[PDB]
């Protein structure tokens, strides 16, 4: 003749166990309980004059010492209830005496700060009306460690020189999967960027500890951002580990130099929304074509191409700029009616103008003209930075000889 004893292990947040004083607990798996038969010491104490309660409290303290447990099992999910473990136990002994059992929480997950007290059960267990129960339900209560809300970092890789229009910019969102992640009901990472950044959808990789995360999320992408929705149950595998989301965005040709181009990362849980900003920039340089004798004389129709230190030529593609070796594919910049022209959408560096076509009445000089792109070489908060003078030498004493 047996009793079934079911333990429903509960976990409460730090400082929130009911003794410490709604819907703020969860079942906890992987808690090992041992059961000890304490029938003998129970009846000894009773014969010695101790009350039932007195003996039970003593047994709770000393009953496991020098006694091998008669059963051992772990809590697990049973019928969609987490933290369950059940034991089938004899009601009576050889002498026909109602038995007594001690339940000890032997080992428990890292999240537990304080284990449940030992439970001593003296059979028969009765309802308030004195009817013996065959199925007995206990609710041992664990206290959880204090844990922070998960952090967020948005990071742009190698961003100190800015970026060329067209360049594939590498980003990372980093967070820490908390130890108490099973306590959460929602975990979402998202990126949203200015319209001057276009997301490369196939670039999105989720890694934990350097290994790719295969499943456990949904992904939704737009032109300028995305959303990762994570299964809470599947995050448990990554508890206490760093998760890194890698992706790329292309900087578009609409990207103005010396403007903050913004993105915003977001971590959304049921508890809080955390937001992190990052920014990238591109660079430019303004020029004015002038006469070598009178700088107030500005010259239209001067035509230039742009070279880098390797001698490669700036080419314009559909989606940005590229450094290539064919001079025929070089983008052509032409001085306008006020002699003005600019180069926009370059990362910091040393570049050169090469004149390919001179204004009417001026000498062609093909000598490379050095210029520097750096923060604020184009503008400062909307205000344009003064143009570099490019001097042209007039055809010398023209109209004197045929
Ligand atoms: Na937490
Ligand atoms: Na990347
Ligand atoms: Na997309
Ligand atoms: Na400028």
mmCIF file of C-alpha atoms and ligand atoms in Angstrom:
data_model
loop_
_atom_site.group_PDB
_atom_site.id
_atom_site.type_symbol
_atom_site.label_atom_id
_atom_site.label_comp_id
_atom_site.label_asym_id
_atom_site.label_seq_id
_atom_site.Cartn_x
_atom_site.Cartn_y
_atom_site.Cartn_z
ATOM 1 C CA UNK A 1 0.000 0.000 0.000
ATOM 2 C CA UNK A 2 1.579 3.182 -1.245
ATOM 3 C CA UNK A 3 1.447 6.929 -1.372
ATOM 4 C CA UNK A 4 2.411 9.026 -4.360
ATOM 5 C CA UNK A 5 4.224 12.204 -3.318
ATOM 6 C CA UNK A 6 4.571 14.950 -5.932
ATOM 7 C CA UNK A 7 6.935 17.886 -5.398
ATOM 8 C CA UNK A 8 6.137 21.036 -7.377
ATOM 9 C CA UNK A 9 9.419 22.941 -7.093
ATOM 10 C CA UNK A 10 8.866 26.712 -7.308
ATOM 11 C CA UNK A 11 11.347 29.518 -7.878
ATOM 12 C CA UNK A 12 10.621 33.059 -6.688
ATOM 13 C CA UNK A 13 12.668 36.220 -7.435
ATOM 14 C CA UNK A 14 15.225 37.498 -4.919
ATOM 15 C CA UNK A 15 13.492 38.923 -1.832
ATOM 16 C CA UNK A 16 10.064 37.730 -3.027
ATOM 17 C CA UNK A 17 9.538 34.266 -1.454
ATOM 18 C CA UNK A 18 6.083 34.383 0.259
ATOM 19 C CA UNK A 19 7.579 34.176 3.779
ATOM 20 C CA UNK A 20 9.480 37.399 2.942
ATOM 21 C CA UNK A 21 6.074 38.861 1.875
ATOM 22 C CA UNK A 22 0.780 37.590 -8.005
ATOM 23 C CA UNK A 23 2.107 35.377 -10.813
ATOM 24 C CA UNK A 24 5.731 36.019 -9.834
ATOM 25 C CA UNK A 25 6.970 32.404 -9.623
ATOM 26 C CA UNK A 26 7.972 29.623 -12.018
ATOM 27 C CA UNK A 27 8.614 25.858 -11.872
ATOM 28 C CA UNK A 28 12.290 24.838 -11.712
ATOM 29 C CA UNK A 29 13.783 21.822 -13.504
ATOM 30 C CA UNK A 30 17.050 20.005 -12.693
ATOM 31 C CA UNK A 31 16.592 20.125 -8.916
ATOM 32 C CA UNK A 32 17.697 16.849 -7.337
ATOM 33 C CA UNK A 33 15.637 15.647 -4.378
ATOM 34 C CA UNK A 34 16.680 12.777 -2.129
ATOM 35 C CA UNK A 35 14.218 10.903 0.066
ATOM 36 C CA UNK A 36 15.232 9.349 3.385
ATOM 37 C CA UNK A 37 13.262 6.864 5.431
ATOM 38 C CA UNK A 38 13.208 8.412 8.923
ATOM 39 C CA UNK A 39 10.556 6.067 10.361
ATOM 40 C CA UNK A 40 12.908 4.558 12.967
ATOM 41 C CA UNK A 41 14.311 7.824 14.466
ATOM 42 C CA UNK A 42 10.812 9.299 14.300
ATOM 43 C CA UNK A 43 9.309 6.648 16.610
ATOM 44 C CA UNK A 44 12.373 6.658 18.843
ATOM 45 C CA UNK A 45 11.959 10.410 19.426
ATOM 46 C CA UNK A 46 8.237 9.923 20.054
ATOM 47 C CA UNK A 47 8.911 7.174 22.610
ATOM 48 C CA UNK A 48 11.449 9.518 24.264
ATOM 49 C CA UNK A 49 8.577 11.966 24.901
ATOM 50 C CA UNK A 50 8.894 14.383 21.951
ATOM 51 C CA UNK A 51 5.811 15.732 20.183
ATOM 52 C CA UNK A 52 5.273 14.932 16.492
ATOM 53 C CA UNK A 53 6.224 18.522 15.476
ATOM 54 C CA UNK A 54 9.311 18.456 17.718
ATOM 55 C CA UNK A 55 10.499 15.198 16.205
ATOM 56 C CA UNK A 56 9.786 16.433 12.668
ATOM 57 C CA UNK A 57 11.904 19.547 13.217
ATOM 58 C CA UNK A 58 14.729 17.530 14.662
ATOM 59 C CA UNK A 59 14.560 15.088 11.735
ATOM 60 C CA UNK A 60 14.551 18.030 9.307
ATOM 61 C CA UNK A 61 17.920 19.053 10.811
ATOM 62 C CA UNK A 62 19.737 15.746 11.553
ATOM 63 C CA UNK A 63 17.729 12.997 9.776
ATOM 64 C CA UNK A 64 20.085 12.729 6.782
ATOM 65 C CA UNK A 65 23.273 12.256 8.836
ATOM 66 C CA UNK A 66 24.642 8.663 8.585
ATOM 67 C CA UNK A 67 21.667 7.529 6.417
ATOM 68 C CA UNK A 68 21.708 6.427 2.755
ATOM 69 C CA UNK A 69 18.734 7.855 0.755
ATOM 70 C CA UNK A 70 16.107 5.381 -0.442
ATOM 71 C CA UNK A 71 15.275 7.400 -3.579
ATOM 72 C CA UNK A 72 16.803 10.146 -5.746
ATOM 73 C CA UNK A 73 15.308 11.930 -8.774
ATOM 74 C CA UNK A 74 15.323 15.288 -10.605
ATOM 75 C CA UNK A 75 12.536 17.786 -11.307
ATOM 76 C CA UNK A 76 11.363 17.986 -14.939
ATOM 77 C CA UNK A 77 8.437 19.137 -17.116
ATOM 78 C CA UNK A 78 5.417 16.830 -16.827
ATOM 79 C CA UNK A 79 2.188 17.733 -18.685
ATOM 80 C CA UNK A 80 3.361 21.297 -19.322
ATOM 81 C CA UNK A 81 4.235 21.894 -15.647
ATOM 82 C CA UNK A 82 7.918 22.615 -15.001
ATOM 83 C CA UNK A 83 9.690 21.545 -11.810
ATOM 84 C CA UNK A 84 7.795 18.317 -11.063
ATOM 85 C CA UNK A 85 9.171 15.184 -9.416
ATOM 86 C CA UNK A 86 7.196 12.266 -7.992
ATOM 87 C CA UNK A 87 7.984 9.411 -5.638
ATOM 88 C CA UNK A 88 6.014 6.263 -4.866
ATOM 89 C CA UNK A 89 6.532 5.307 -1.211
ATOM 90 C CA UNK A 90 5.347 2.626 1.222
ATOM 91 C CA UNK A 91 2.647 3.752 3.689
ATOM 92 C CA UNK A 92 3.634 1.298 6.444
ATOM 93 C CA UNK A 93 6.625 -0.729 7.689
ATOM 94 C CA UNK A 94 7.133 -4.328 8.895
ATOM 95 C CA UNK A 95 5.583 -3.376 12.259
ATOM 96 C CA UNK A 96 2.473 -1.844 10.628
ATOM 97 C CA UNK A 97 3.620 1.652 11.619
ATOM 98 C CA UNK A 98 2.814 4.706 9.530
ATOM 99 C CA UNK A 99 6.097 5.732 7.898
ATOM 100 C CA UNK A 100 8.005 9.017 7.986
ATOM 101 C CA UNK A 101 10.002 10.541 5.125
ATOM 102 C CA UNK A 102 12.533 13.360 4.836
ATOM 103 C CA UNK A 103 12.895 15.250 1.540
ATOM 104 C CA UNK A 104 16.221 17.005 0.970
ATOM 105 C CA UNK A 105 17.015 19.313 -1.951
ATOM 106 C CA UNK A 106 20.474 17.924 -2.726
ATOM 107 C CA UNK A 107 21.572 19.906 -5.824
ATOM 108 C CA UNK A 108 19.945 22.876 -7.583
ATOM 109 C CA UNK A 109 20.593 25.141 -10.635
ATOM 110 C CA UNK A 110 22.979 28.130 -10.464
ATOM 111 C CA UNK A 111 20.000 30.535 -10.400
ATOM 112 C CA UNK A 112 19.011 29.405 -6.912
ATOM 113 C CA UNK A 113 20.259 31.614 -4.068
ATOM 114 C CA UNK A 114 18.456 29.867 -1.180
ATOM 115 C CA UNK A 115 17.157 26.298 -1.376
ATOM 116 C CA UNK A 116 13.870 25.124 0.131
ATOM 117 C CA UNK A 117 13.991 23.846 3.707
ATOM 118 C CA UNK A 118 13.907 20.082 4.177
ATOM 119 C CA UNK A 119 10.390 18.645 4.417
ATOM 120 C CA UNK A 120 9.521 15.897 6.864
ATOM 121 C CA UNK A 121 6.325 14.051 6.070
ATOM 122 C CA UNK A 122 4.651 11.900 8.717
ATOM 123 C CA UNK A 123 2.056 9.516 7.342
ATOM 124 C CA UNK A 124 -0.816 9.476 7.105
ATOM 125 C CA UNK A 125 -1.094 12.926 5.544
ATOM 126 C CA UNK A 126 -4.627 14.079 6.108
ATOM 127 C CA UNK A 127 -6.896 16.762 4.684
ATOM 128 C CA UNK A 128 -8.339 19.320 7.185
ATOM 129 C CA UNK A 129 -11.128 16.796 7.900
ATOM 130 C CA UNK A 130 -8.834 13.883 8.826
ATOM 131 C CA UNK A 131 -9.092 11.797 5.638
ATOM 132 C CA UNK A 132 -5.811 10.138 4.591
ATOM 133 C CA UNK A 133 -4.399 11.213 1.215
ATOM 134 C CA UNK A 134 -2.992 8.750 -1.347
ATOM 135 C CA UNK A 135 -1.605 11.512 -3.591
ATOM 136 C CA UNK A 136 0.249 14.188 -1.594
ATOM 137 C CA UNK A 137 1.365 17.484 -3.152
ATOM 138 C CA UNK A 138 4.234 19.569 -1.741
ATOM 139 C CA UNK A 139 5.368 22.983 -2.991
ATOM 140 C CA UNK A 140 9.007 23.573 -1.955
ATOM 141 C CA UNK A 141 10.105 27.149 -2.623
ATOM 142 C CA UNK A 142 13.479 28.321 -3.896
ATOM 143 C CA UNK A 143 14.775 31.881 -3.878
ATOM 144 C CA UNK A 144 16.480 33.166 -7.017
ATOM 145 C CA UNK A 145 19.676 35.190 -7.121
ATOM 146 C CA UNK A 146 19.492 38.870 -7.981
ATOM 147 C CA UNK A 147 20.187 39.266 -11.695
ATOM 148 C CA UNK A 148 20.447 42.370 -13.849
ATOM 149 C CA UNK A 149 18.471 43.185 -16.923
ATOM 150 C CA UNK A 150 20.411 42.042 -20.015
ATOM 151 C CA UNK A 151 22.834 44.634 -21.493
ATOM 152 C CA UNK A 152 23.071 45.952 -25.050
ATOM 153 C CA UNK A 153 25.940 47.215 -27.150
ATOM 154 C CA UNK A 154 25.720 48.478 -30.737
ATOM 155 C CA UNK A 155 29.154 48.609 -32.368
ATOM 156 C CA UNK A 156 30.476 49.704 -35.760
ATOM 157 C CA UNK A 157 33.677 47.849 -36.730
ATOM 158 C CA UNK A 158 36.698 49.927 -37.873
ATOM 159 C CA UNK A 159 34.888 53.277 -38.010
ATOM 160 C CA UNK A 160 37.677 55.769 -37.200
ATOM 161 C CA UNK A 161 38.329 56.959 -40.803
ATOM 162 C CA UNK A 162 34.652 57.044 -41.822
ATOM 163 C CA UNK A 163 33.382 55.170 -44.895
ATOM 164 C CA UNK A 164 33.087 55.477 -48.673
ATOM 165 C CA UNK A 165 29.615 55.666 -50.146
ATOM 166 C CA UNK A 166 28.909 52.122 -51.338
ATOM 167 C CA UNK A 167 31.065 50.522 -48.661
ATOM 168 C CA UNK A 168 29.720 47.520 -46.747
ATOM 169 C CA UNK A 169 29.812 48.647 -43.101
ATOM 170 C CA UNK A 170 30.098 45.935 -40.420
ATOM 171 C CA UNK A 171 27.891 46.210 -37.322
ATOM 172 C CA UNK A 172 27.425 44.133 -34.168
ATOM 173 C CA UNK A 173 24.666 43.984 -31.563
ATOM 174 C CA UNK A 174 25.916 42.320 -28.392
ATOM 175 C CA UNK A 175 23.969 41.232 -25.336
ATOM 176 C CA UNK A 176 24.342 38.745 -22.502
ATOM 177 C CA UNK A 177 21.802 35.993 -22.143
ATOM 178 C CA UNK A 178 20.899 36.240 -18.430
ATOM 179 C CA UNK A 179 21.142 33.247 -16.077
ATOM 180 C CA UNK A 180 17.434 33.699 -15.292
ATOM 181 C CA UNK A 181 16.337 33.839 -18.962
ATOM 182 C CA UNK A 182 13.588 31.206 -18.383
ATOM 183 C CA UNK A 183 11.920 33.887 -16.209
ATOM 184 C CA UNK A 184 11.328 36.058 -19.332
ATOM 185 C CA UNK A 185 8.453 35.859 -21.850
ATOM 186 C CA UNK A 186 10.002 37.916 -24.707
ATOM 187 C CA UNK A 187 13.516 38.596 -26.061
ATOM 188 C CA UNK A 188 13.838 40.650 -29.259
ATOM 189 C CA UNK A 189 16.822 42.318 -30.916
ATOM 190 C CA UNK A 190 16.242 44.886 -33.621
ATOM 191 C CA UNK A 191 18.167 47.442 -35.680
ATOM 192 C CA UNK A 192 16.710 50.563 -37.272
ATOM 193 C CA UNK A 193 18.821 52.899 -39.414
ATOM 194 C CA UNK A 194 18.594 56.189 -41.303
ATOM 195 C CA UNK A 195 17.443 55.841 -44.906
ATOM 196 C CA UNK A 196 21.063 56.408 -46.022
ATOM 197 C CA UNK A 197 21.988 52.919 -44.754
ATOM 198 C CA UNK A 198 20.645 49.847 -46.574
ATOM 199 C CA UNK A 199 20.684 46.487 -44.832
ATOM 200 C CA UNK A 200 22.252 43.480 -46.516
ATOM 201 C CA UNK A 201 19.766 40.753 -45.351
ATOM 202 C CA UNK A 202 21.992 37.724 -45.990
ATOM 203 C CA UNK A 203 24.717 39.329 -43.787
ATOM 204 C CA UNK A 204 22.798 38.660 -40.549
ATOM 205 C CA UNK A 205 24.538 36.088 -38.332
ATOM 206 C CA UNK A 206 23.724 35.197 -34.726
ATOM 207 C CA UNK A 207 26.608 33.701 -32.783
ATOM 208 C CA UNK A 208 27.021 32.528 -29.197
ATOM 209 C CA UNK A 209 30.552 31.866 -27.929
ATOM 210 C CA UNK A 210 31.792 31.985 -31.544
ATOM 211 C CA UNK A 211 29.370 29.231 -32.713
ATOM 212 C CA UNK A 212 26.457 29.948 -35.082
ATOM 213 C CA UNK A 213 22.937 29.743 -33.614
ATOM 214 C CA UNK A 214 21.021 27.441 -35.956
ATOM 215 C CA UNK A 215 17.411 27.740 -34.737
ATOM 216 C CA UNK A 216 15.214 29.337 -32.094
ATOM 217 C CA UNK A 217 14.403 32.636 -33.826
ATOM 218 C CA UNK A 218 12.350 34.406 -36.416
ATOM 219 C CA UNK A 219 13.764 37.189 -38.570
ATOM 220 C CA UNK A 220 11.925 40.039 -40.277
ATOM 221 C CA UNK A 221 13.881 42.493 -42.479
ATOM 222 C CA UNK A 222 13.086 45.866 -44.041
ATOM 223 C CA UNK A 223 15.271 48.062 -46.250
ATOM 224 C CA UNK A 224 16.741 49.825 -43.220
ATOM 225 C CA UNK A 225 16.539 47.377 -40.305
ATOM 226 C CA UNK A 226 15.390 44.031 -38.908
ATOM 227 C CA UNK A 227 13.888 42.193 -35.922
ATOM 228 C CA UNK A 228 15.036 38.938 -34.313
ATOM 229 C CA UNK A 229 12.441 37.265 -32.107
ATOM 230 C CA UNK A 230 13.939 34.590 -29.836
ATOM 231 C CA UNK A 231 12.290 31.539 -28.306
ATOM 232 C CA UNK A 232 12.814 31.825 -24.541
ATOM 233 C CA UNK A 233 12.936 28.030 -24.111
ATOM 234 C CA UNK A 234 15.790 27.763 -26.677
ATOM 235 C CA UNK A 235 17.821 30.600 -25.093
ATOM 236 C CA UNK A 236 18.349 28.455 -21.960
ATOM 237 C CA UNK A 237 21.121 26.642 -23.873
ATOM 238 C CA UNK A 238 22.968 29.985 -23.986
ATOM 239 C CA UNK A 239 22.338 31.106 -20.377
ATOM 240 C CA UNK A 240 25.211 33.305 -19.100
ATOM 241 C CA UNK A 241 26.834 33.462 -22.538
ATOM 242 C CA UNK A 242 27.401 36.405 -24.845
ATOM 243 C CA UNK A 243 25.251 36.604 -27.957
ATOM 244 C CA UNK A 244 26.529 38.640 -30.896
ATOM 245 C CA UNK A 245 24.452 39.615 -33.934
ATOM 246 C CA UNK A 246 26.615 40.560 -36.930
ATOM 247 C CA UNK A 247 25.295 42.373 -40.002
ATOM 248 C CA UNK A 248 26.290 44.766 -42.762
ATOM 249 C CA UNK A 249 24.687 47.877 -44.128
ATOM 250 C CA UNK A 250 25.618 49.711 -47.273
ATOM 251 C CA UNK A 251 26.143 53.433 -47.109
ATOM 252 C CA UNK A 252 24.096 54.968 -49.942
ATOM 253 C CA UNK A 253 25.009 57.840 -52.268
ATOM 254 C CA UNK A 254 22.355 59.988 -50.548
ATOM 255 C CA UNK A 255 24.716 60.029 -47.527
ATOM 256 C CA UNK A 256 25.845 63.610 -46.919
ATOM 257 C CA UNK A 257 29.510 64.079 -45.811
ATOM 258 C CA UNK A 258 30.120 65.337 -42.269
ATOM 259 C CA UNK A 259 26.622 64.322 -41.178
ATOM 260 C CA UNK A 260 25.981 61.845 -38.361
ATOM 261 C CA UNK A 261 24.469 58.783 -40.087
ATOM 262 C CA UNK A 262 22.596 57.037 -37.273
ATOM 263 C CA UNK A 263 21.474 53.552 -36.410
ATOM 264 C CA UNK A 264 19.685 52.400 -33.286
ATOM 265 C CA UNK A 265 19.871 48.937 -31.760
ATOM 266 C CA UNK A 266 17.126 47.742 -29.411
ATOM 267 C CA UNK A 267 16.688 44.924 -26.914
ATOM 268 C CA UNK A 268 13.046 44.429 -25.978
ATOM 269 C CA UNK A 269 11.992 42.114 -23.152
ATOM 270 C CA UNK A 270 8.708 41.847 -21.239
ATOM 271 C CA UNK A 271 10.428 43.921 -18.518
ATOM 272 C CA UNK A 272 12.357 46.760 -20.255
ATOM 273 C CA UNK A 273 13.257 48.300 -23.622
ATOM 274 C CA UNK A 274 16.940 49.155 -24.006
ATOM 275 C CA UNK A 275 18.187 51.311 -26.886
ATOM 276 C CA UNK A 276 21.736 51.941 -28.140
ATOM 277 C CA UNK A 277 22.841 54.360 -30.878
ATOM 278 C CA UNK A 278 25.788 54.156 -33.234
ATOM 279 C CA UNK A 279 26.885 56.472 -36.029
ATOM 280 C CA UNK A 280 29.014 56.498 -39.134
ATOM 281 C CA UNK A 281 30.223 59.258 -41.389
ATOM 282 C CA UNK A 282 31.529 59.883 -44.889
ATOM 283 C CA UNK A 283 33.787 62.728 -46.067
ATOM 284 C CA UNK A 284 34.137 65.288 -48.816
ATOM 285 C CA UNK A 285 36.208 68.223 -50.105
ATOM 286 C CA UNK A 286 35.166 71.404 -51.933
ATOM 287 C CA UNK A 287 37.234 73.108 -54.627
ATOM 288 C CA UNK A 288 37.169 76.351 -56.586
ATOM 289 C CA UNK A 289 38.995 76.715 -59.918
ATOM 290 C CA UNK A 290 40.690 80.122 -60.122
ATOM 291 C CA UNK A 291 43.144 82.098 -62.260
ATOM 292 C CA UNK A 292 46.737 82.153 -60.949
ATOM 293 C CA UNK A 293 46.967 85.981 -61.142
ATOM 294 C CA UNK A 294 43.513 86.931 -59.810
ATOM 295 C CA UNK A 295 41.905 84.493 -57.349
ATOM 296 C CA UNK A 296 38.603 86.371 -57.735
ATOM 297 C CA UNK A 297 38.425 85.052 -61.352
ATOM 298 C CA UNK A 298 36.577 81.702 -61.166
ATOM 299 C CA UNK A 299 36.812 79.319 -64.143
ATOM 300 C CA UNK A 300 34.062 76.954 -65.456
ATOM 301 C CA UNK A 301 34.471 73.777 -67.518
ATOM 302 C CA UNK A 302 37.639 72.561 -65.786
ATOM 303 C CA UNK A 303 37.370 68.765 -65.672
ATOM 304 C CA UNK A 304 39.016 66.510 -63.098
ATOM 305 C CA UNK A 305 39.289 62.874 -62.100
ATOM 306 C CA UNK A 306 40.264 61.594 -58.647
ATOM 307 C CA UNK A 307 43.152 59.284 -57.764
ATOM 308 C CA UNK A 308 44.222 57.588 -54.531
ATOM 309 C CA UNK A 309 47.752 56.998 -53.219
ATOM 310 C CA UNK A 310 47.982 53.682 -55.087
ATOM 311 C CA UNK A 311 47.337 55.551 -58.353
ATOM 312 C CA UNK A 312 43.874 53.962 -58.814
ATOM 313 C CA UNK A 313 40.947 55.995 -60.199
ATOM 314 C CA UNK A 314 37.628 56.777 -58.519
ATOM 315 C CA UNK A 315 34.752 55.031 -60.331
ATOM 316 C CA UNK A 316 31.024 55.548 -59.681
ATOM 317 C CA UNK A 317 28.812 52.424 -59.662
ATOM 318 C CA UNK A 318 25.052 52.103 -59.213
ATOM 319 C CA UNK A 319 25.340 51.995 -55.403
ATOM 320 C CA UNK A 320 28.499 53.976 -54.607
ATOM 321 C CA UNK A 321 32.197 54.432 -55.397
ATOM 322 C CA UNK A 322 35.042 52.000 -56.194
ATOM 323 C CA UNK A 323 38.812 52.333 -56.714
ATOM 324 C CA UNK A 324 39.749 50.737 -60.051
ATOM 325 C CA UNK A 325 42.743 50.714 -62.395
ATOM 326 C CA UNK A 326 41.136 51.793 -65.721
ATOM 327 C CA UNK A 327 41.430 55.573 -66.299
ATOM 328 C CA UNK A 328 38.595 55.360 -68.846
ATOM 329 C CA UNK A 329 36.056 54.533 -66.094
ATOM 330 C CA UNK A 330 37.047 57.471 -63.854
ATOM 331 C CA UNK A 331 34.257 59.732 -62.600
ATOM 332 C CA UNK A 332 34.570 63.244 -64.035
ATOM 333 C CA UNK A 333 34.101 66.320 -61.852
ATOM 334 C CA UNK A 334 33.521 69.606 -63.654
ATOM 335 C CA UNK A 335 33.783 73.146 -62.301
ATOM 336 C CA UNK A 336 30.455 74.995 -62.642
ATOM 337 C CA UNK A 337 29.628 78.629 -63.573
ATOM 338 C CA UNK A 338 31.121 79.897 -60.271
ATOM 339 C CA UNK A 339 34.220 77.673 -60.720
ATOM 340 C CA UNK A 340 33.001 75.380 -57.948
ATOM 341 C CA UNK A 341 33.084 71.613 -57.620
ATOM 342 C CA UNK A 342 33.352 68.997 -54.880
ATOM 343 C CA UNK A 343 34.106 65.384 -54.084
ATOM 344 C CA UNK A 344 31.635 63.753 -51.719
ATOM 345 C CA UNK A 345 31.364 60.268 -50.233
ATOM 346 C CA UNK A 346 35.003 59.380 -49.434
ATOM 347 C CA UNK A 347 36.565 58.015 -46.249
ATOM 348 C CA UNK A 348 39.393 59.924 -44.575
ATOM 349 C CA UNK A 349 42.642 59.839 -46.542
ATOM 350 C CA UNK A 350 45.108 61.501 -48.924
ATOM 351 C CA UNK A 351 43.720 61.872 -52.466
ATOM 352 C CA UNK A 352 44.649 63.703 -55.676
ATOM 353 C CA UNK A 353 42.929 65.634 -58.453
ATOM 354 C CA UNK A 354 44.136 65.132 -62.017
ATOM 355 C CA UNK A 355 43.040 67.766 -64.559
ATOM 356 C CA UNK A 356 42.023 66.124 -67.847
ATOM 357 C CA UNK A 357 40.458 69.156 -69.562
ATOM 358 C CA UNK A 358 41.372 72.826 -69.097
ATOM 359 C CA UNK A 359 39.034 75.861 -69.171
ATOM 360 C CA UNK A 360 39.056 77.915 -72.378
ATOM 361 C CA UNK A 361 42.239 80.018 -72.453
ATOM 362 C CA UNK A 362 44.159 78.138 -69.731
ATOM 363 C CA UNK A 363 47.058 75.682 -69.824
ATOM 364 C CA UNK A 364 46.378 72.047 -69.024
ATOM 365 C CA UNK A 365 48.510 70.986 -66.080
ATOM 366 C CA UNK A 366 48.086 67.270 -65.353
ATOM 367 C CA UNK A 367 50.229 67.401 -62.191
ATOM 368 C CA UNK A 368 48.435 65.561 -59.349
ATOM 369 C CA UNK A 369 46.873 68.020 -56.878
ATOM 370 C CA UNK A 370 46.864 66.591 -53.303
ATOM 371 C CA UNK A 371 43.894 67.057 -50.993
ATOM 372 C CA UNK A 372 42.857 65.603 -47.632
ATOM 373 C CA UNK A 373 39.544 64.232 -46.517
ATOM 374 C CA UNK A 374 39.098 64.238 -42.749
ATOM 375 C CA UNK A 375 36.326 65.075 -40.287
ATOM 376 C CA UNK A 376 34.973 68.533 -41.241
ATOM 377 C CA UNK A 377 36.924 68.960 -44.526
ATOM 378 C CA UNK A 378 33.518 69.310 -46.232
ATOM 379 C CA UNK A 379 31.216 70.904 -43.599
ATOM 380 C CA UNK A 380 30.604 71.543 -39.890
ATOM 381 C CA UNK A 381 26.967 71.251 -38.722
ATOM 382 C CA UNK A 382 25.514 72.374 -42.066
ATOM 383 C CA UNK A 383 28.106 75.140 -42.639
ATOM 384 C CA UNK A 384 30.313 74.386 -45.645
ATOM 385 C CA UNK A 385 34.048 74.438 -45.271
ATOM 386 C CA UNK A 386 35.936 76.815 -47.510
ATOM 387 C CA UNK A 387 36.994 75.374 -50.878
ATOM 388 C CA UNK A 388 40.585 74.586 -51.824
ATOM 389 C CA UNK A 389 41.783 76.918 -54.595
ATOM 390 C CA UNK A 390 42.902 75.096 -57.731
ATOM 391 C CA UNK A 391 45.001 77.540 -59.760
ATOM 392 C CA UNK A 392 45.104 77.690 -63.558
ATOM 393 C CA UNK A 393 47.868 79.447 -65.480
ATOM 394 C CA UNK A 394 46.610 81.442 -68.459
ATOM 395 C CA UNK A 395 48.104 80.832 -71.890
ATOM 396 C CA UNK A 396 51.131 83.032 -71.599
ATOM 397 C CA UNK A 397 51.025 86.313 -73.548
ATOM 398 C CA UNK A 398 48.408 84.805 -75.887
ATOM 399 C CA UNK A 399 47.318 86.921 -78.838
ATOM 400 C CA UNK A 400 50.895 88.199 -79.301
ATOM 401 C CA UNK A 401 52.016 85.442 -81.677
ATOM 402 C CA UNK A 402 50.037 83.623 -84.458
HETATM 403 NA NA1 LIG B 1 17.951 39.016 -15.647
HETATM 404 NA NA1 LIG B 2 29.859 41.533 -40.762
HETATM 405 NA NA1 LIG B 3 15.513 43.622 -46.214
HETATM 406 NA NA1 LIG B 4 33.081 72.433 -48.327
#
